Structures are given as C-alpha cells and as structure tokens.
Write an enzyme that holds these catalytic residues in place. Sequence first.
Site, PDB file in Angstrom:
ATOM      1  N   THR A  59      36.503  46.511  37.050  1.00 16.25           N
ATOM      2  CA  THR A  59      35.925  47.845  36.878  1.00 16.25           C
ATOM      3  C   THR A  59      36.538  48.541  35.663  1.00 16.25           C
ATOM      4  OG1 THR A  59      35.189  48.424  39.114  1.00 16.25           O
ATOM      5  CG2 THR A  59      36.069  50.201  37.735  1.00 16.25           C
ATOM      6  N   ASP A 102      32.548  49.838  45.417  1.00 16.24           N
ATOM      7  CA  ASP A 102      32.097  48.742  44.562  1.00 16.24           C
ATOM      8  C   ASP A 102      32.248  47.365  45.215  1.00 16.24           C
ATOM      9  OD1 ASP A 102      30.668  47.961  42.211  1.00 16.24           O
ATOM     10  OD2 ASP A 102      32.492  47.501  41.169  1.00 16.24           O
TER      11      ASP A 102
HETATM   12  O1  LIG Z   1      40.624  39.657  41.087  1.00 15.83           O
HETATM   13  C1  LIG Z   1      40.592  40.864  40.666  1.00 15.83           C
HETATM   14  N1  LIG Z   1      39.414  41.336  40.312  1.00 15.83           N
HETATM   15  C2  LIG Z   1      39.531  42.603  39.895  1.00 15.83           C
HETATM   16  N2  LIG Z   1      38.386  43.173  39.482  1.00 15.83           N
HETATM   17  C3  LIG Z   1      37.224  42.312  39.240  1.00 15.83           C
HETATM   18  C4  LIG Z   1      37.559  40.888  38.813  1.00 15.83           C
HETATM   19  C5  LIG Z   1      37.398  39.632  39.398  1.00 15.83           C
HETATM   20  C6  LIG Z   1      37.884  38.579  38.607  1.00 15.83           C
HETATM   21  C7  LIG Z   1      38.439  38.942  37.379  1.00 15.83           C
HETATM   22  S1  LIG Z   1      38.322  40.670  37.276  1.00 15.83           S
HETATM   23  S2  LIG Z   1      41.144  43.278  39.944  1.00 15.83           S
HETATM   24  C8  LIG Z   1      41.763  41.770  40.563  1.00 15.83           C
HETATM   25  C9  LIG Z   1      43.177  41.454  40.906  1.00 15.83           C
HETATM   26  C10 LIG Z   1      43.428  40.079  41.422  1.00 15.83           C
HETATM   27  C11 LIG Z   1      44.421  39.812  42.369  1.00 15.83           C
HETATM   28  C12 LIG Z   1      44.626  38.510  42.846  1.00 15.83           C
HETATM   29  C13 LIG Z   1      43.840  37.453  42.389  1.00 15.83           C
HETATM   30  N3  LIG Z   1      44.005  36.182  42.825  1.00 15.83           N
HETATM   31  C14 LIG Z   1      43.229  35.184  42.362  1.00 15.83           C
HETATM   32  C15 LIG Z   1      42.225  35.404  41.413  1.00 15.83           C
HETATM   33  C16 LIG Z   1      41.995  36.687  40.915  1.00 15.83           C
HETATM   34  C17 LIG Z   1      42.788  37.730  41.383  1.00 15.83           C
HETATM   35  C18 LIG Z   1      42.631  39.035  40.935  1.00 15.83           C
END
Ligand SMILES: O=C1N=C(NCc2cccs2)S/C1=C/c1ccc2ncccc2c1
Lengths: 257, 298
Positions: free
Chosen positions: B17, B128
Amino acid sequence: PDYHEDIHTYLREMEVKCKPKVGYMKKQPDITNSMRAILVDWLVEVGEEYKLQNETLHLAVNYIDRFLSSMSVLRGKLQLVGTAAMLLASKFEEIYPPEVAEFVYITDDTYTKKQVLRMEHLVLKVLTFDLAAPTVNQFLTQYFLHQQPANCKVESLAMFLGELSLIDADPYLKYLPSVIAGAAFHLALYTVTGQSWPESLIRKTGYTLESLKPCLMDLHQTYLKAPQHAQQSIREKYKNSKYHGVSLLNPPETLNL
Amino acid sequence: PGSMENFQKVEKIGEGTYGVVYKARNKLTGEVVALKKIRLDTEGVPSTAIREISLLKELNHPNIVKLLDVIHTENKLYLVFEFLHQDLKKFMDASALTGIPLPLIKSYLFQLLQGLAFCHSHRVLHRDLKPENLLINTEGAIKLADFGLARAFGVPVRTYTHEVVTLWYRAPEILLGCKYYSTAVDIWSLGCIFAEMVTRRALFPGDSEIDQLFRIFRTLGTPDEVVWPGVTSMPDYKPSFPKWARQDFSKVVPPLDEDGRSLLSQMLHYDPNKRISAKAALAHPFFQDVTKPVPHLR
Ligand SMILES: O=C1N=C(NCc2cccs2)S/C1=C/c1ccc2ncccc2c1
C-alpha cells in the site's frame, strides 16, 4: 454492536497505559499550567480554522501531555511541540489533514518547516509511535448510545464540557478520559433534561455517581466559572449552531448529590 | 532499536500500500525478516506509516503479521516484520488448478476470521483485504498484513475516507456512497477471497465502480428495499440500475458444500447490519471439522 463491549473494555485498558504523568508540570522548570492553557486554547482555534475533528484536538493534547511527561521544554519551544502534535493527530485521524506548510503558517512563522518536521520525528520517537490513544470523545460517543431518547443538546454540551477539561491540567490530568466523559455526560444530561448518570452506564462502566463525584465537582466548578476563564476559545466555538449553541446554556447552580 | 547494521538484504519482494518490502536476514540471530522501507524525503512521516505502526504495535495475534521493530531515522524508515513464506496472491499464481484443497481453504478462512475478529474487537478496520495482503507460512498459518490503509474507528463510526478497498474486493455500501461504513466492509472482502480460493478466479473482477456494481448485482441479485432497507436512498443508487435475479450458490461456487454456501451467503449479505461478523462466523457449522493442513512449497 457485536464489538461495542469488546471495544469499550479495550479502551479502558489502553487509557491507563496512555495516561500522562499526573505531576509533570512541577517537574517542568520553564513551563507552567498557565502556558499549557494558552497552548491548548490555541489548538482549539487551529481546529476551528481548519475545520478539524474534535477527536483530532483530544489526540493532540494527549500527545503533548505524554511528551511533556518525559521531555523538559523551554517556553519558546512549547508551541513547536503543540504544532508537531497537532500535525501528528491530523495525520492519524483526519481524512484530509492540513499540509505541513499550513501548520508552519499558523505558528506565525516563528518556526521553520524543518523544525516542525524534526519535532514531528522527536514526538514520534518519544511516544514510540503509540498514537492510538483513547480520548474523552471516544468514551462520550459510546455513552451517548444510552440516551432515552437521544438529545442533540445533551450531546453537544457533554462534548463542550469534556473539551473545557483539556485546558486545565490542574485538576483534570488526574482523571482518566472515561471518568471525565462520565462526569461530562452526567452534567450535560442534568443541565438539559434534569436526568442523571443512567443505570445502564453504571453497569457498563462500573462507575457510580459517587465514583464520578470528585471529577464532577471540579467539572461543575469549571462549568460555572467558564465565562470568567482567561481562555475563551472553547466557549466561542460552542456558540455555533454546529454545536447547537450549547455554551449559551446556563449551568445549574447545584447538583444535589 | 534495532539497527540496520545487523540486517543483510536478500531481495526485493515487492511494493505494498506504501513503501517497498524486502526479504532480509538478521546476521546475529539468523532470523529471516521482512523489511518495509519508507523514504522520508517526500511532508514528514506519511499518515499510512503512522497508522500502520501505531496499530500493528497494538495488535498481537497469531493471525496478524508480527511487527518486530521500527528503525528510524536516516532519511529512511524501516519496519521490521517476521518473515513468513509468500503472500496468498503469489501462492495462488504458483498453484496448480488442484493445488489448493478445500480443507486448506477452510483452515485459511477460519484463521483470517480469527485475525479479523481481533482487529475489529480492537477498533481497527483493515480496509484492504485482498490476496496480496495475506501471508502464508509453510506450516499452515495465514496472517493479515499491510495495515497501511487501516484505521482506528470509533463507536459508533463517523464518516471515514471514501474508497477504500481495492475495487474487486470493495463492499456495495462503499460503492453506493454510504456516509457510514464499518466492520462489515472487511467481511465482504473476506467473502470475495473465500470464493476466489474455491473457484481459483476473482469473484467480481470489475474495471470501474459501475462495472463492479453490475457484477455484484448479476451474482447476488439487484438489491431492493426488501433485501436491503434504505438502499434506494443511498447517494449513488440509481433507479435505472438493471434488474438481475439472484444466482444459486451451487452455481456461484460449485465445489462448495451446503455449510460453505451458507457461510459465503452470510458474508456477502447486502445489508451490512445483517452481514455476519467475524466473531459470529467462527462458530458457523462449516468449521465443525476444521484442521490445519499444510500448503505446498510452491
Ligand atoms: O508481505 C507484505 N505485503 C505487504 N504489502 C503488500 C505486499 C505483498 C508482497 C510484497 S508487498 S507489507 C508485507 C510484510 C511482510 C511480512 C512477512 C512476509 N513474509 C513472507 C513474504 C512477504 C512478507 C511480507
């Protein structure tokens, strides 16, 4: 309403954790309750000027009081703390927060944008980013659901009373938001309808008229002395039809407890 | 507190986001972490970050992503999270057609409802919920993530930001311009996600708000006053809306049993007041034989 109880329980827990230090002004060598009254009154005008939520105001005050609970501040820098707090509260709470340049503007250019932004960071660091504080306003809106029936004058008057409490750290700093909200609601209800802190709320909150008495005596006096107080921005605000002109209502002379 | 010296970036995972998300490794403990990088040279600290940090610091639950630390400041702000496996969108993209069994779906929905019930009980709207913001580990867990669009709400609610929710997952009360929306918007989103896991395609993949509405109406029937009192008085309601008959859920989600169909319908009720809460949903008969199956490793 599937979460009303859960949420109220949680806010009661958090208000204890978010409570500023009751005796902090005595540990501040350069600032005083009087100067704080001036600051908070000014934030009310800021809130009016930019048509901000009442909740935003309550939040900024919580942030200021918590900040000043551990950080010594010179009188020349107190407005900077307040400005940064109002900016933070706006970002947290508002749909359309005023821009940073607008907060720089209302300090009458005493501080620069960079100072406001640096103070924003410092406030965040000092509060460790814990900005979701319960306010008097959050308790009041819940208490309003217990009206029989709902009364616009009662609601605005309670909000007015709760807002007056923000100005005067002595005595209000010693009372929790849920207690000030209870006293404000009772006193508003009594002033308008003659009615009293209702049984459904005694049972929801665990607060009796008696447990609310100490805050209610103070708030009573504050209400009576309101026209004489050095700070008048809240009275002027609550003359507006937006708030049903409730600051024009006469305070009751006695409460009969 | 917390120091960036101790982390070794592994790869960029993607963009949320707000901010950019990286996989990294704590060099001293060995913990694999996610780092969400926000550049502060853009107006001070963004409201999205202020809200996510403040709210995630409060929310400690097995089905909500764990915020470990905040490293501030160096013209950059870094949020440190536990690292799981993969987001649900990527998982579904990586899954063969038969790769996501109904027992895994049941378990995932059950856990998402737990995480959501916890948010709502702590006066947080997520706003979201979509596959990309949901995270799975290799051991069967799924967690809510990306609270950049979330907010702390009041009882009762005031008017908050209008849209809100990525379009495919957006509730009809938001599309119709209601002055008030509340916890039901998150339930709608989860209902859409439930259908999407089962059928392996988005339930309502609209390209505009009107397209989105018409897609919803073709599936659930065009709402009237009998089904949703007040609907004809809503800001963006139109008397000219086409009339479509409600579809049979056996045809909306063929692989789904009677209990599954019942829960889905309760999650997609038009009237947000009648729409099931996350808390009440946990005791739905659909979950009578729920377990915790493991997913494939991609
Ligand atoms: O996965 C996360 N996704 C967030 N916002 C949307 C997104 C999805 C993928 C990239 S950006 S914040 C976020 C933090 C997070 C925490 C642990 C995780 N473990 C594995 C893979 C992605 C991770 C992301």
